[PDB]
Design a protein around this ligand. Structure first.
Ligand SMILES: CC[C@@H](C/C=C/C1=C(C)C(=O)[C@]2(O1)C(=O)N[C@@](OC)(C(=O)c1ccccc1)[C@@H]2O)SC[C@H](NC(=O)CC[C@H](N)C(=O)O)C(=O)NCC(=O)O
Ligand SMILES: CC[C@@H](C/C=C/C1=C(C)C(=O)[C@]2(O1)C(=O)N[C@@](OC)(C(=O)c1ccccc1)[C@@H]2O)SC[C@H](NC(=O)CC[C@H](N)C(=O)O)C(=O)NCC(=O)O
Ligand SMILES: [Co+2]
Ligand SMILES: [Co+2]
Lengths: 215, 215
């Protein structure tokens, strides 16, 4: 049957992509609800947050790290969670760093520029630079690394790549990628991994950013 | 020997307490560096963030979820990570919810009121209410629950309780706890668990908040 239901947004969502990806790779069918905050969704996430999950099990879950790990752990033969205890902890590290130090800061750079949230050129400039100072850590770490953790694809590669896809959607044009070659290579590499390509729209990159910090 | 070194702040820190707690419970000695951002600390966390960890191993880690899980997983007999795959995912859920939807929002309520960060009565009021709307979820969930996950103490109880201790330090006086009985009971219960009491200053609660949203 269907393994469970996943509440999300239409298309590719930065906190959802890995969840779709490892579900397919683990052979778990999912019912994708692309309409958020129905009675069913609030039953899981009272604050109405995407992603939210409920199994056929009828087991309930928010948050994205928890859902991704849950679905992944289903296959006991998976190689997406590290060789050993250290690589696992490392997978946890990158997943938490990307989700709090990159997505949360990039969100406050972005929403004002879409008119969701009040706009202040200086607030937005702050977040843009705080977001990039966190991405700079990854650029640097990836100097002469292929994968975020260990020597093969992990959940961190999938989950993090899906996270940072927010920036490739709006801000990271050719210039930015010239300037940030390792993150760009690694991101473009994870996007072409079949597990990840299978559950996403066609790969596409900005030429110029869709956004600069104008209102 | 010492199992590793932990960079933190002096005294009880909301993202550090569980890490100390499960290290002791697992019989791992830790060298506690209470002076952040030395050359050694930046070697782990280039952004200078607490907690950061390095084993005698010389294995390196930030972020707090990753460190806590790493140290905990050391004992293969631990009961702090759930009976099964669901309870594990649940432990991951509460750890991520407390760390992003409570600590991050409570931080922006708090820092302006300490003068770390610019102050705007309305910005602070926003965060205060967004912080409480996330805590309300826990109040509600804990109605007729003892532990966050399963039927015994887990890492989520320890880690989350340490997180929310920020609020008990500054904002949550007798009034607040009258108003929010389940979170209060559960917090006060985790603080009296010996594993957690062992690595903290004496238990103490506000009468009146140390802070209201004045500058
Ligand atoms: C970037 C992709 C996300 C879109 C974000 C939307 C968003 C809105 C709208 C919004 O109000 C905000 O982000 C948010 O959710 N909280 C927010 O305002 C309080 C914020 O600044 C913040 C949150 C947490 C910590 C610090 C600041 C911000 O303005 S993905 C869709 C959203 N998902 C999540 O937020 C899940 C997060 C959780 N940690 C997890 O599963 O990992 C979402 O559902 N937003 C709708 C909403 O009303 O909250
Ligand atoms: C609440 C206990 C924390 C104290 C927070 C201090 C703090 C300062 C100072 C600061 O600038 C800020 O919080 C921060 O770190 N980033 C911040 O500004 C960009 C912010 O608003 C934010 C961060 C992330 C997502 C959204 C917003 C905010 O003003 S604990 C000590 C601090 N630890 C961490 O931040 C670790 C977080 C990581 N996810 C993890 O290990 O889990 C710390 O070291 N702060 C110092 C600093 O300069 O960053
Ligand atoms: Co650079
Ligand atoms: Co109430």
């Amino acid at each position: 049957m269907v393994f469970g239901t996943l509440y999300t947004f239409p298309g590719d969502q930065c906190r959802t992509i890995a969840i779709k990806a490892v579900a397919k790779a683990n052979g778990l069918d999912l019912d994708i609800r692309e309409t958020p905050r129905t009675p069913d969704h609030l039953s899981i996430s009272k604050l109405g947050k995407v992603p939210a999950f409920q199994g056929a099990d009828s087991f309930k879950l928010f948050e994205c790290m928890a859902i991704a790990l849950y679905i992944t752990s289903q296959n006991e033969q998976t190689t997406l969670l590290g060789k050993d205890k250290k690589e696992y902890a490392e997978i946890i590290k990158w997943m938490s760093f990307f989700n709090t130090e990159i997505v949360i800061l990039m969100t406050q750079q972005l929403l004002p520029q879409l008119g969701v949230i009040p706009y202040d050129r200086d607030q937005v400039e702050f977040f843009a630079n705080m977001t990039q100072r966190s991405v700079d850590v990854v650029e640097e770490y990836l100097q002469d690394r292929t994968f975020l953790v260990g020597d093969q694809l992990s959940l961190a590669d999938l989950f993090c790549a899906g996270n940072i896809s927010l920036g490739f959607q709006f801000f990271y044009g050719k210039a930015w990628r010239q300037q940030n070659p390792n993150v760009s290579r690694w991101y473009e590499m994870v996007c072409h991994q079949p597990i990840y390509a299978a559950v996403t729209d066609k790969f596409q990159l900005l030429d110029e950013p869709k956004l600069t910090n104008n209102p």
